[PDB]
Design a protein around this ligand. Structure first.
Ligand SMILES: Cc1cc2nc3c(=O)[nH]c(=O)nc-3n(C[C@H](O)[C@H](O)[C@H](O)COP(=O)(O)O)c2cc1C
Ligand code: SF4
Ligand code: SF4
Ligand code: SF4
Ligand code: FES
Ligand code: FES
Ligand SMILES: [K+]
Lengths: 263, 44, 213, 431
């Protein structure tokens, strides 16, 4: 009854009021590019990778945050949308370090993959890059903060999901730095999940460091026995060896998180 | 009598470190009771 | 210009700081300016108050404001690092702030900057050995028509020449408090050479009021 | 109908204490017409007050120029349980702009009275005034005026004997140009970093403390009481169509007499410089370019300054904007590339860092422009720099990203030969 009508590339779709442009695209099987947006975190709207053209609107909107209005035609593949993605990806990679061979994220990196699928194929940045100092937040999460793209997923997860207010940004402008400011360890029981939600290799697992690459792991979907919650997990193995433990999405149990002990 | 020739904004030459917050403290008696959201903070 | 903190003997969480009994009454008035249930709105005015009492913000000063307002310390650290008027290192008794943005740069704020360095012997960003002065460049201070200008603590000194700023430093060295405002021949923002407007006597109450109140 | 605008008479000037030659406190302000029949204005209702602002043709004086009456009527709805607020934008951060400062320190009681009248039109319970922290002495003047209004029953309980309750609060910034942005201002009042919010929601629905809110500039708020007393039709008799009223101007840079002056909208830019600022340093023929409405607006060359009018529509057609109407004059001895590069450096220092195109793009344009100053670039980089600025513009959360792209585009548009020439000089010096 309350459902309004919108269009994705001219295809009609019925959505509830308050649905975002990103969620309307989800219905027809389109996945808008993203970095800051996470469906289990509060909306941020800062990476600007989800910019999409609305037909007849001169300005692209941030799909992750903009609520759809009745009758909108979202153009997910327009020349305007495609140029917005290339421009934003260009800004993301301008100061990003050439770390992929030594970066544990390589091969399962959303920055690599969305650069392949939505960015340009070359650079025109001719300057020196930003370099940021690293920060210790305990024995579980290694931080290479030069790789951070300031998506603020970790900050939002810690505040909303883990209920811990230690992470935040300091400074402003290009020198805005995600961290704790003071020397502090982020030692929650849910801390290890910030590795998963960080789209880049800025936050990675210290125990897992350097040991494998994503393509070569075999994925075994199993269950955790560290407690009685029954968290669903993926056991990554390679050549007969357990390499790491990853969450497996189950809406009715662990959603997409696992405890540190489980991890 | 009219006089357009002098600067009549000279008081601030004698303002101090706590001038502004002293005024804010004297103003506190005239304020209306503040509205309440119903809880001590967003974290309650 | 570093936005991470490392504890040091003079800047660490145990560094003694607390508001004076008088400054706790000022804090109470600051907090009451905002709706109940949103006391976090007082972070900026209370950190600034601690800076006025102490001269700069040690990590213990940030930790104290966080406690009093029941806010996470990180959220106080974010405000201290974000806003440029907060001093996270000690500065001299007089914090000289020269504007170098284009409107001031066009009126030769370079000469003003050069004069201060020559007189004090320091560079931009440095503090004199006696810890009396600190020198920095800043962005537009909203006194563009009175350029070149500087701000020393809470006072604007405007329409400066190299001689004018040199005198101001001399007056400060002697403990004196120079008069703020333009050092040229005018009082505030009016045209030099006589007013080109507002030369009639202002019309009093009721002038030009439409009928029907 | 009128055809030529300018020569504003002293009887039609609103900020009649602009230069501070009269007592700025309550006694002086009341004697000049402030706080007169405010009770009568309040009792006429919000619909009547909003009608006078709509007819006056008033447009935002903070830089964006949205029709003020239409914008203020967004808050003309019933309460849904939350308080309603007016936030007065006294951040006054745009380089070249210093008009809002004179109102606060010399005409404080017009701002306080404008808060009450404007606050009534919106049904707001109080006004928070956000003044930049560097304006300590002007903030102190404003507090003194507010105390005088409280002690005379003009604001507070039963304001002006009207039955309306209104508080005026002054909150000081802490050094950030971005906090002049309307949603970044709200986030700062709430105690966070001055980082703009996305829209929607709009401030008139979810604003300061998550309550309906309107952000208005000091000059916009400080002329409403006079618009109500003298009628919006009188205000609409100035300037062109859709450019109504009087406007404060800051002329700085390379003029004989830099100054702040009130003048009619649509006054020719040449007349404004010559009459009030004493002409361009070295004669009009020494003019090189003008940044007509603050550092955010594109520059325009002398060939466009000859006839251009100073209003929203005239400057838009000159490929710029009125902005805050802060005129920066650059004579023929200016290094134009360096002057614009210093503006990009300012925007680099002022970006909040929240969103990618500005956090990364503005810094990128700063590095390119630093090389352009020395000539240490190739001509092909000029078109790259243009394209980079177009990727920032229209893709950011707030307008600071746009405001950094426009001055770059203004330079490349009108001074590409100077850019290419300098690169060719650098190349020959190092061959
Ligand atoms: C970076 C930036 C800085 C701004 N600074 C100011 C300012 O200092 N004063 C102001 O009135 N508006 C400023 N604005 C414009 C405000 O966002 C907003 O448009 C204005 O306050 C609305 O009031 P008005 O309709 O009366 O003009 C700024 C905008 C941006 C993007
Ligand atoms: S985060 Fe991704 S793009 Fe960046 S270095 Fe690591 S693998 Fe490469
Ligand atoms: S560390 Fe990772 S999750 Fe956190 S802001 Fe940076 S890129 Fe985002
Ligand atoms: S455009 Fe710049 S100032 Fe505005 S929100 Fe984005 S990063 Fe912050
Ligand atoms: S996914 Fe929308 S701005 Fe980041
Ligand atoms: S440019 Fe220096 S005060 Fe504005
Ligand atoms: K990761």
């Amino acid at each position: 009854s309350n459902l309004i009508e919108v269009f994705v590339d001219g295809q009609s779709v019925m959505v509830e009021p308050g649905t975002t442009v990103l969620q309307a695209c989800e219905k027809v099987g389109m996945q808008i590019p993203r970095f800051c947006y996470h469906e289990r975190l509060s909306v941020a709207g800062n990476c600007r990778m989800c910019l999409v053209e609305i037909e007849k609107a001169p300005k692209v909107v941030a799909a992750c945050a903009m609520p759809v209005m009745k009758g909108w035609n979202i153009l997910t593949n327009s020349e305007k949308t495609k140029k917005a993605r290339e421009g934003v990806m260009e800004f993301l990679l301008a100061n990003h370090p050439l770390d992929c061979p030594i970066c544990d994220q390589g091969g399962e990196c959303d920055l690599q993959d969305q650069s392949m699928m939505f960015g340009s194929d070359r650079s025109r940045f001719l300057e020196g890059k930003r370099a940021v100092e690293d920060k210790n937040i305990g024995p579980l999460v290694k931080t290479i903060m030069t790789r951070c793209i300031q998506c603020t997923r970790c900050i939002r997860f810690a505040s909303e999901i883990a209920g811990v207010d230690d992470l935040g940004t300091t400074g402003r402008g290009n020198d805005m730095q995600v961290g704790t400011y003071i020397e502090k360890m982020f030692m929650s029981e849910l801390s290890g999940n910030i590795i998963d939600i960080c789209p880049v290799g800025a936050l990675t697992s210290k125990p897992y460091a350097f040991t494998a690459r994503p393509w070569e792991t075999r994925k075994t979907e199993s269950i955790d026995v560290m407690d009685a919650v029954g968290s669903n997990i993926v056991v990554s193995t390679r050549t007969g060896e357990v390499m790491r433990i990853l969450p497996r999405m189950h809406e009715d149990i662990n959603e997409e998180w696992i405890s540190d002990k489980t991890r | 009598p009219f006089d357009n020739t002098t600067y009549k904004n000279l008081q601030h030459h004698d303002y101090s470190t706590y001038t502004f917050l002293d005024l804010n403290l004297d103003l506190s008696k005239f304020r209306m009771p503040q509205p309440s959201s119903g809880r001590e903070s967003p974290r309650h | 210009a570093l936005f991470v903190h490392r504890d040091t003997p003079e800047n660490n969480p145990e560094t003694p700081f607390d508001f004076t009994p008088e400054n706790y009454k000022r804090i109470e008035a600051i907090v009451k300016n905002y709706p109940e249930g949103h006391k976090a709105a007082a972070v900026l005015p209370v950190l600034d108050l601690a800076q006025r009492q102490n001269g700069w913000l040690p990590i213990s000063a940030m930790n104290k404001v966080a406690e009093i307002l029941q806010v996470p310390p990180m959220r106080v650290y974010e405000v201290a690092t974000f806003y440029t008027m907060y001093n996270r290192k000690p500065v001299g008794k007089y914090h000289i702030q020269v504007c170098t943005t284009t409107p001031c740069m066009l009126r030769n704020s370079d000469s003003i900057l050069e004069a201060i360095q020559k007189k004090l012997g320091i560079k931009v960003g440095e503090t004199t050995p006696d810890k009396l002065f600190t020198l920095i460049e800043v962005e537009c201070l909203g006194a563009c028509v009175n350029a070149p200008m500087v701000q020393i603590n809470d006072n604007y000194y405007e329409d400066l020449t190299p001689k004018d700023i040199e005198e101001i430093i001399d007056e400060l060295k002697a403990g004196k408090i120079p008069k703020p405002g333009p050092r040229s021949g005018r009082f505030s923002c009016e045209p030099a050479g006589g007013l080109t407007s507002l030369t009639e006597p202002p019309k009093g109450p009721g002038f030009g009021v439409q009928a029907g109140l | 109908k009128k055809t030529s605008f300018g020569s504003l008479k002293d009887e039609d000037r609103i900020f009649t204490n602009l230069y501070g030659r009269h007592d700025w406190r309550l006694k002086g302000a009341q004697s000049r017409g402030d706080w007169y029949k405010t009770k009568e204005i309040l009792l006429k209702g919000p619909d009547w007050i909003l009608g006078e602002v709509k007819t006056s043709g008033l447009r935002g004086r903070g830089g964006a120029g949205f029709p003020t009456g239409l914008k203020w009527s967004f808050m003309n709805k019933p309460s849904d349980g939350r308080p309603k607020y007016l936030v007065v934008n006294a951040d006054e951060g745009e380089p070249g702009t210093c008009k809002d400062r004179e109102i606060i320190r010399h005409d404080p009681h017009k701002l306080v009275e404008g808060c009450l009248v404007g606050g009534r039109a919106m049904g707001a319970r109080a006004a928070y005034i956000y003044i930049r922290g560097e304006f300590y002495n002007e903030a102190s003047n404003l507090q003194v005026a507010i105390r005088e209004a409280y002690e005379a029953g003009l604001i507070g309980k039963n304001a002006c004997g009207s039955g309306y309750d209104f508080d005026v609060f002054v909150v000081r910034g802490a050094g950030a140009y971005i906090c002049g942005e309307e949603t970044a201002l709200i986030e700062s009042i709430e105690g966070k970093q001055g980082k703009p919010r996305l829209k929607p929601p709009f401030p008139a629905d979810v604003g300061v403390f998550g309550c309906p809110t309107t952000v208005a500039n000091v000059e916009t708020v400080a002329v409403s009481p006079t618009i109500c007393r003298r009628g919006g039709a009188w205000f609409a008799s100035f300037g062109r169509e859709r450019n109504s009223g009087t406007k404060l101007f800051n002329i700085s840079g390379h003029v004989n007499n830099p100054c702040t002056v009130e003048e009619e909208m649509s006054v020719p830019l040449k007349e404004l410089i010559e009459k009030h600022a004493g002409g361009v340093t070295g004669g009009w023929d020494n003019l090189l370019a003008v940044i007509p409405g603050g550092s955010s607006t594109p520059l325009i060359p002398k060939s466009v300054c000859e006839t251009v009018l100073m209003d929203f529509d005239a400057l838009i057609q000159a490929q710029t904007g009125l902005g805050t109407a802060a005129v920066i004059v650059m004579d023929r001895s200016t290094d134009i590339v360096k002057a614009i590069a210093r503006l990009i450096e300012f925007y680099k220092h002022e970006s909040c860092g929240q969103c990618t195109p500005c956090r990364e793009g503005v810094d990128w344009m700063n590095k390119v422009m630093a090389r352009f100053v020395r000539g240490d670039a190739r001509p092909a980089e000029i078109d790259s720099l243009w394209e980079i600025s177009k990727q920032i513009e229209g893709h950011t959360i707030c307008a600071l990203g746009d405001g950094a792209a426009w001055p770059v585009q203004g330079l490349i548009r009108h001074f590409r030969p100077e850019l290419e020439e300098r690169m060719q000089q650098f190349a020959q010096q190092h061959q």
